[PDB]
Design a protein around this ligand. Structure first.
Ligand SMILES: CC(C)(C)[Si](C)(C)OCCC[n+]1cccc(C(N)=O)c1
Ligand SMILES: CC(C)(C)[Si](C)(C)OCCC[n+]1cccc(C(N)=O)c1
Ligand SMILES: CC(C)(C)[Si](C)(C)OCCC[n+]1cccc(C(N)=O)c1
Ligand SMILES: [Zn+2]
Ligand SMILES: [Zn+2]
Ligand SMILES: [Zn+2]
Ligand SMILES: [Zn+2]
Ligand SMILES: [Zn+2]
Ligand SMILES: [Zn+2]
Ligand SMILES: [Zn+2]
Ligand SMILES: [Zn+2]
Lengths: 349, 349, 350, 348
C-alpha cells in the first residue's frame, strides 16, 4: 500500500476538521487493520467538535468517524476468525470484555471502559474517516457479506442506535400499540423502518420540514405530523386521545422531550436518543404518566449489530445516503451542520 | 518453569486415568497459561471414559479436568485484562465467540463450536487436572478474588449447571411458586441453595436417601419426599393438588422424569439436568399439562458463572469438598465410580 | 404499468434547472414497449443540452431527461414479439430510421434520415429514462442484459458504448507493438482503457491533469501516464522512443488536448475527438498533422457494439464506478454534475 | 525497467506529479544510482513559486536536490565505486577544471553557468525517482552503513549551514557568540554544527515558541523571539558587545535588519535563507566597522564529507518523516503548510 494515508482529523478546538496525510498504522497482536470502504458522518461529531476546551477530552488530533465498514487488510498476530479481504462492520462502543455487562454482550454499557481508557473509534481512538483504520479486537468486527459499503456504514450507528433504543422496550410494541418517532434524520428514518420490521406497532413520525415528513411516509410511517407546540395535540388526534406506547426522540431538544411527555401513555416509554446540551426529561409524580419509563440509551450491543446487518441483508432497510470523498469530509460536516443532508452522509475513500 | 509437567490423562479406551509426564505448554498469542490451584472431578468424566471404542474416533491422549481454577502464570502475546498471579476460574463450554449465541453471552449454546472443533477443557481440549493449563482466550477466565480455589472449582460445573437451569425460568419462581428438586445430592444440593438465594419459591426435596433429604432441609428445603412411585401423590399432597411451578430433575432417570410430568403445574417447567442414556420426557397432548415446557439445559453462560462466583463469595453457596493431590488423581476417579466421595472431589496440584 | 401517474425529472424551461414532476403513465402503442425503469444514468451531455441558449436549443420542452436507460419489460405493444414481461434490457440510445443504408448496416447512430424524420434519442428530444416508466419506440432498440446489475448497466449505454465505438473504428490498427494514447481519465477515458486492454494488445499511455487521475489510469490498466499540457506530447514520445502513437483517443476534447493529439499521433495513425468542447477542432492539413493520420468525431455507437459492451461487462472486463440517486434527488444529482462532485457516473434508481 | 516513476514539475504554477519517464542509462563517466532516499526542502517550493519569467531550470524537471542511493550501473571508464556502494549526491555540480573547482569549491565554480552545468533537481534530473544519473564520480560521497534516510538531509540541510559556518569558523572561539535566526530546518542543524565544531555561545531566534524550545535541546544557550524587540533582547544577553556572527536562515528583510543591529564590530552576517528582494545594506554607519556580509551557496565537497563524518559520529540528529515515491506530491503539500516536523524524505 502506502506509508501514509488520507484522513479527516479534528486538530484544534473551535476549528473545522482538516484533511491530512498521516502515517498508515500497523496491527499489533490481536488487532486488525482495515481498508475503509465507507465512513459515515454523525451529528454527534458536531456535538464533540462544539465542546469547549474544558469539556473536550478525546485528545487532539482525532481521526473522526465512528460509522465504519471496510475489508480486512492485515491480520495481527494470533487473529483468527477473519481472512484478508473479508467485508466487516466495526462495532463501535468498545468495552473491556470482562465485566458483567460485557459478558452479557452489552459492551456498550461496560462499567470499566471509562476507568481503563477504552474509547470508540472516532471518539477517543482513531476513527474510520481515513483510508485505513485499526480495530482493537476481532470481537468488534461483524461480517457484512456482499452488502454495499455505502449503505452498510450507517448500520453501525444510524441503524444500531435506533435498533437498541427500540429493543429495550420491544415487548411493549405488539399489535395495537403506537410508537412515536421524533426526528426523521439519519437515525429516525432508519428507526421507522426497524419498527415496521420487528414489530406490528403503528408508527407516527414527527419532524419540522415537509420533506422529512414525506421521507417518513416513504419509509413506512403510518402517519406524520409536524413538530412544535401543536405536535402533542396532532398525535393524540390520530390516536383518538389514547397516547403513544413508546416515544423515540432522536432530536433530544427540550421541546421534543416535552412533546414526548405530553403524549406518552401510562406504563409507556420515552427514549431520549438525540443529544442537546442541557435538555432532559422531567420524571416526577404528576409531571409524567405513571409507569412511563425514560432512558437515554447509548449505541447498541454486538448481537443487535448482527441483527441490524441481518435486516439489511434481508432487504428490510432502505438507507438514504449521500456520498462524499475524503477531501470533501470537512465540506460534508458543514452540510450536516446546516441540515442539508437528507439522511446519512457517507465518506468513501 | 520446567520443561515437563504431570497430568492425569485418559490414554486409551477402557483404561483408567494415569498420572503421566508431558511437556509444559507455552501460551501463544491470545492464550493464557495458568498454574492450576484446583481441578474438580465429576461423574461426567466417568460417562466420557465409559464411551465405547466403537464410538471412539479421536481425542487421545486427553488431559482430564473441566472444572479448573488457577493463577495466571504467563500471558500470551497481546493478552490484556489480567496480570500474573490473578486468581481465575475457567469457563468450561468454550465457543467461537462470534456467532449470535456467543455475542449474547450464551457461549454454551454456540452454534459453530461443533463445526470448528471447539471443545471444552477436559472434554476434547487439555483439561485442568495438571500442574499447568492453557486457556484459549481471556474471555474464558472469570476472577475469583480471594475465594478458596478448592471451593471455587466445583462452582465451574456443580454450581454453574444448576444455576443456568434455574435461571432459564427464574421469573416464574415468585412468591407462591413451588420448585421441586429431584435428587438432592451433588447438583441438587447446590440447586436448593441457589433457589433460596435468588427466589422466594417453596422448595420440595425429592430423593431416595433419607439422610440426603435431611441435609437438603438444612440448606433450605421446606419439605422432603422419598423418590419412587409414591413421590407424585406425596408432592401433590403438599402443593394442595395445584402442581409444582418448576421441576428440576437432577437424576434424569425415566422414573424421575415420569414423576416430574405428573407433578408439574399447568404452564410450568421441567428441566432434565441429570443424564441417563435413553431417558426422555414425552411432551404431547394429555401426556403433560398444557404450557409446561421441557428442556435439557447445558452447562451455563459466562455471566452466570460470575453470578455463581458472587453467591459463593457472599457466603450463599457452600459445596463440601474432598481434596486430593495430583498423584491421587486416578485414585479419586476410582473413588468417584464407587460413590465414596462425600461432597465434590478436588485435585490440588 | 400500474398507476395513471408517474414521477419524472424534466427540463421545462430554458436556463432553469430540472424539476421533479408528476405526469401520466404512458401506454405502449403498436410496436412500442413500456419499461419499468431500473436505472437511469446522468452524464455531462445533459449539462451541454441544458446550457444551450434559447435559439440554439431545438430538442423540445418539456423533456424527460435520461439517455442512459435500463429497465424491465412492463408491457408489450401490439405486435411486439421478441421480449417477455420482466426481461431486463438496456435502451439503445441513438435511434435511427431503420431503413436507410447506414441503418441496414447496423450503424443506426449514423442514420442519414433521422434528422429529417425528427427521430431523436431518449432524453435528447424524446422522453428519457429518468422516470418510473418509459416508452421505447421499437424492439430493436432493446438489448438484453440478463442478471447484470441495472445500475452497472446504465453507464454502459453511453460511458461504455461511446469509447467502445471510437476504439472499434480503428481497432485493426491496434495490434501488438502499437500504442494508444488516452487523454482524459474521467468517466469515458477510464472505461476506454479497460476496453483497450480487453480487445487489444496495444500499449496504453494515459494523459490527464491530476496526480490522482494519473494513478487511477495506471490502476485500470495504463502502462504509463503523463501530465497533460504543453509538454504532454514530448512526455509521450519519451516513453515510446520518439515513435509516435498509433491512435489518440481524446476524451477531453479541448483545443489543447487536440493539439497534443496532433503532436503525438504517428504517421498513418488516428485521432478520435470524443470529448465535447464547443469550438474546439483538429486542424487537418499538410505540415499540421502527420501523413495518413485520420481524424474523426465519432457519435455514440452501434447496436452490435452495445451488445459487445454488455458481453464485456457480464464477463467482468468492465468496471465503472457509480453513485446512486433517488428520483426525487434527480435535480440535486444534476447540480452535483455541474460542480463536478460526482465520482464516476451518477445513476437514478426509481 | 524500461520506464520509471518520478516526481516532476511539468508546467509553471502547477503542482508536482508522479509521471512515468524512461529509465536513464549511464554514459561514459556517468553513474546510475538506485535512489534510496530523496529529501524535500523549502527551496523546492521557492523554485516552483517562481513566475514564468524568472524560472530558468527548464521543464519538465525531476525534483530532488537531496539525493542518496546505491550504485546500480557504472558508465564506461568509471572506477572508484562498486555496484551496491551507498553514496550521497554532491549537489552544486561544477566544471571541475576552473580555479575554484581545483580548490575544492565546486559550489563557486566560475564556468558552470556558461557551460550549462546545473544541480540535480535544479536544472538537471533530480533524485526524486526510482533511478537517477550522476554526471561524475567526484559528485558521489560514500556514506557507509549510514541510514540513507538520515544521509539525505545532510546534502543540503547539513551542508549549507556547515559551509556558512565554516566561512568564519576561526572567529567562533571561546567567548564568541553566534546568533541563529530561524531554527527550523537548516537552522536546527546549524545550531548542532556550532556546538560540534566550536565553543561559541549560541543564541536561537525564531517566531515560534515550540521551535525555540527545540533549539535549546540541541545546544542553544538562549532563546529570543523574532520581532522588533529581538535586537534589544539579543544585546541584553550579550551586553553591549553584540554577536560575533549572525547566521540568518530566514533571510527576510526584518531578520536581516535584526542581524545588522546585533552583529559585533569585525563580525559577520550570513544571509542563508532566501526571500526575494531582501538584502543587507552594507554601508558606513549602517553596519558596524569590519562586519562582513555574504550570501553563501550550498557547500564544498570536502565539507559534505565532514558533514557525513559528523552524522556518523552521532553529532547530527535530524528528525525525518519517510514518504513513498507515490506520496511525493502529497509530502510537498505538507511542506507548503509547514506540517512536517524535521525533514521529509522520499524512499522509492
Ligand atoms: C458434555 C458431557 C456429556 C461430558 Si456433560 C453435559 C454430562 O458434562 C460436562 C460438564 C458440565 N455438565 C455437568 C453435568 C450436567 C451438565 C448438563 N445438564 O448439561 C453439564
Ligand atoms: C455528442 C453530442 C455533442 C452530439 Si451530445 C451533447 C447530443 O451527446 C449525447 C450522446 C452521448 N454521448 C456522450 C458523450 C460523447 C458522445 C459522442 N462522442 O458523440 C455521445
Ligand atoms: C537560495 C538559492 C538561490 C541558493 Si536556491 C532556492 C536555488 O537553493 C537550492 C540549494 C539548496 N539550498 C537550500 C537553502 C539555502 C541554500 C543557499 N543559501 O545556498 C541552498
Ligand atoms: Zn454517532
Ligand atoms: Zn466491560
Ligand atoms: Zn463436572
Ligand atoms: Zn459461537
Ligand atoms: Zn450520457
Ligand atoms: Zn436510417
Ligand atoms: Zn534542500
Ligand atoms: Zn569550475
Amino acid at each position: 500500500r502506502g506509508s501514509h494515508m488520507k484522513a479527516v482529523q479534528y486538530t484544534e478546538i473551535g476549528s473545522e476538521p482538516v484533511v491530512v496525510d498521516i502515517p498508515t498504522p500497523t496491527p499489533g497482536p490481536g488487532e486488525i487493520l482495515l481498508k475503509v470502504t465507507a465512513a459515515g458522518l454523525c451529528h454527534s461529531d458536531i456535538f464533540v467538535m462544539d465542546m469547549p476546551a474544558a469539556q473536550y477530552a478525546y485528545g487532539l488530533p482525532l481521526t473522526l468517524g465512528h460509522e465504519g465498514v471496510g475489508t480486512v487488510a492485515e491480520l495481527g498476530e494470533g487473529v483468527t476468525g477473519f481472512g484478508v479481504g473479508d467485508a466487516v462492520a466495526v462495532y463501535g462502543p468498545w468495552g473491556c470484555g470482562a465485566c458483567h455487562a460485557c459478558a452479557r454482550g452489552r459492551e456498550n454499557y461496560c462499567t470499566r471502559a471509562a476507568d481503563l481508557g477504552i474509547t470508540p473509534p472516532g471518539l477517543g481512538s482513531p476513527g474510520s474517516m481515513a483510508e485505513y483504520m485499526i480495530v482493537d479486537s476481532a470481537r468488534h468486527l461483524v461480517p457484512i457479506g456482499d452488502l454495499d459499503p455505502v449503505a452498510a456504514a450507517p448500520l453501525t450507528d444510524a441503524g444500531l442506535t435506533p435498533y437498541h433504543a427500540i429493543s429495550r422496550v420491544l415487548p411493549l410494541l405488539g399489535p395495537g400499540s403506537t410508537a412515536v418517532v421524533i426526528g426523521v434524520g439519519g437515525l429516525g428514518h432508519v428507526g421507522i423502518q426497524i419498527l415496521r420490521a420487528v414489530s406490528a406497532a403503528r408508527v407516527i413520525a414527527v419532524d419540522l420540514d415537509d420533506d422529512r415528513l414525506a421521507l417518513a411516509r416513504e419509509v413506512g410511517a403510518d402517519a406524520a405530523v409536524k413538530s412544535g407546540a401543536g405536535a402533542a395535540d396532532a398525535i393524540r388526534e390520530l390516536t383518538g386521545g389514547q397516547g403513544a406506547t413508546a416515544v423515540f426522540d432522536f432530536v433530544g431538544a427540550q421541546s421534543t422531550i416535552d412533546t414526548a411527555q405530553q403524549v406518552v401513555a401510562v406504563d409507556g416509554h420515552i427514549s431520549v436518543v438525540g443529544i442537546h446540551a442541557g435538555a432532559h426529561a422531567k420524571v416526577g409524580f404528576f409531571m409524567i404518566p405513571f409507569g412511563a419509563s425514560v432512558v437515554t440509551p447509548y449505541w447498541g450491543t454486538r448481537s443487535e449489530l448482527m441483527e441490524v446487518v441481518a435486516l439489511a441483508r434481508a432487504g428490510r432497510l432502505d438507507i438514504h445516503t449521500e456520498t462524499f470523498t475524503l477531501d470533501e469530509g470537512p465540506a460534508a460536516y458543514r452540510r450536516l451542520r446546516e441540515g442539508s443532508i437528507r439522511g446519512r452522509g457517507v465518506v468513501v475513500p
